Design a protein around this nucleic acid. Structure first.
Lengths: 140, 64, 143, 68, 63, 140, 143, 67
DNA sequence: CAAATGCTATCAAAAAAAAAAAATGATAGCAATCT
DNA sequence: AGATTGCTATCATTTTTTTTATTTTGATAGCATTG
């Protein structure tokens, strides 16, 4: 029950990817790692926003043929129930001084509905929403 | 690749045919999927290395 | 079918609700109106953020016991397919000028999939998404 | 709002023309009414006025914007 | 075979458009079908005669 | 309601149609008269067994555009529920000395299902199947 | 899908069921086998006509509490549309000598609409109906 | 019966060859098995034997012709 | 009256048929392996 | 050394996919005639 956040799933794709995060992703059981539609939408947009060239085209190729097919069946949707969670999480934090970006809240509420562990670089937002978190930039 | 399955129990065949149609697939596609899922299981994908590869291949990117 | 964006569903609940908008909502047949999960979220949070008192308790009840139930089964989730659409609706608008805010992209993208018409006061964005839009704040002319 | 109906059974036409004459209306007026009548039937609830009430019950609200 | 309906309440129009799509048919087919049903309800067919004639119309048959 | 046995619904078409039967069919409220798919099957077959020609062609035309459309929605299917009834109806009558043709059985059963009064010139069978009967060859 | 006629489903219940047939029935996926309301009518009538006693009673229960329920949702009715097929299956047979009886027509007709295969011991008739048949009593060869 | 599976990705294919080898059998024997187990799983009820039992329970019955 | 009717029209998009291309389901034929 | 297995191939369908006509809606525009 692990839910990758945008910044995590996209770390290995970067120029100087953090090897600690790659190693961690390499220690997981794919059949136990999820993605939020909101997160997939952010990835797909990231690809789509690239200037046209061989780069954008191969990336898209992979993104759809190699990467995304690995989570097929586990790309969680943001629905009505989850929308209620979102409201609680965000309204709560906000009225107690901690801000939670809508972007984050979406993932948070999702993780929160299936008691999943959000994996992310910015743990503040999630500790606040009362959601198990794991920063893969560390050890343990 | 092609593969021929002969001497297939009649029932086992009826059953697969059933699964296929009951899911709107041709029997052939059904078997193809089945064998596909099995391969899928047998395999342990290396998520971290998988991506970092695709990234090193395309000069790396930053999807925000 | 029509997809109501947050700001319309809110109009009637306001102090001096624009009459033209309320008139248009009544000229509608419920079973035709849909809401995006995103929008429900917004509504649900907009309520949660009010100072604790009587007003917020009632609104919260009416909200969950009256309003929303009326859209049961017609609340559209932001699923994986919709994401793909979202990806294009936004990259497109950008490499064309008018950029779209993610939230608005979710709604547009959702609407587009099912080729629905978005009812919003802020149409200025959606039209750039190649989705049909309608402003109930405005008058109808149609040819 | 106007709409045409071509290839309307000639029998149906007379039947409607008849019903209209029976009542004191024009054929168009009769169509308008047999139409408007079923429409009002589909109208299970009036969303506008519905939400308005909720508004009046609480003296009206002004939800925060919340949207980048 | 042709009729024009004008000054039609944009809303009644909505209601119809709706019942139309829900049954997978054009709005027009809908009116056509509605009017058609009205006519049928306004009509009283005399089953005996109606057949007795179709009968004499073809020289008589037996089933 | 009223279910028309095959012989009644087809009398008017016969060469020298019996006027008492025609006049009674004329006193009925169409919206209360039904047909069994079984009966509709024999009607249609009756038309099919005619030598291709104007007669057959027109009879067919009329049978599909003018007659059956009048019963649209009131043509009762022979289903499981009915099948059970049919089995009781025929078993009883038969193990009592009154043969009930499987033909008539299907109707009597359809009728006994929704509580209808069958119209037929063969009253004898139906009385034995415990179903309201009416002989349109008589009066009242 | 497969439509079982009366005689095939009757076999297993007999004194000395036909080995080959039973085996065949055994090689099927229940949810693929169906029954025409007609055939169900028959099976029930066949039961009802027995002499009163233990056998009849037991068999009755087995029929209603065990057999038929396995076919719930798969017992095909003889509805208006099937009737059209019917009229044509029989007419076409008469104009080719080989006559088809009403009962057989009903079953055939049903099968044809849903484009199924009739499993009967008397394929004799059904072939003239222009419908696929299969005799579980016979064997299976090449194509 | 027989069946030919065309357009089977070499990946899946190699996966199945491996499986078979590891399992000590031929690929055609492996697929035959893989399918068999699946089929065994769908076989909820055995209509013949099921009906047979009933027959055996009442000592067989000969049902009147009727048709 | 001007507004309302009853008919015929326009006219640019949506909403059966003819042709072209895949797959599917059944075997059929061999050379190279195992029993 | 006869059965099994691995690979291709033939072939009469089904099933799709793509093209190419035809119909139908939408929506509202003329025109001569009653609340």
């Amino acid at each position: 029950m692990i839910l990758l956040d945008t910044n995590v799933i996209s770390e290995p794709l970067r120029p100087q990817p953090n090897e600690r995060v790659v190693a961690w992703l390499d220690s997981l059981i794919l059949e136990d790692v999820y993605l939020s539609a909101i997160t997939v939408a952010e990835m797909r947009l990231g690809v789509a926003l690239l200037l046209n060239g061989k780069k954008k085209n191969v990336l898209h190729e992979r993104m759809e043929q190699s990467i995304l097919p690995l989570f097929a069946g586990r790309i969680l949707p943001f629905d009505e129930p989850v929308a209620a969670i979102y409201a609680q999480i965000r309204s709560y934090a906000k009225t107690h001084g901690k801000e939670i970006a809508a972007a984050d809240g979406y993932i948070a509420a999702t993780a929160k509905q299936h008691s999943m562990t959000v994996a992310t670089r910015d743990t503040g937002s999630f500790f606040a929403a009362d959601v198990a978190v794991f920063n893969p930039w560390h050890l343990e | 690749a092609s593969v021929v399955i002969r001497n297939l129990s009649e029932a086992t065949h009826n059953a697969i045919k059933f699964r296929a149609r009951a899911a709107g697939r041709s029997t052939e596609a059904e078997i193809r999927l089945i064998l596909d899922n099995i391969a899928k299981a047998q395999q342990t994908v290396r998520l971290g290395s998988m991506l970092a590869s695709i990234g090193q291949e395309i000069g790396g990117v930053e999807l925000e």
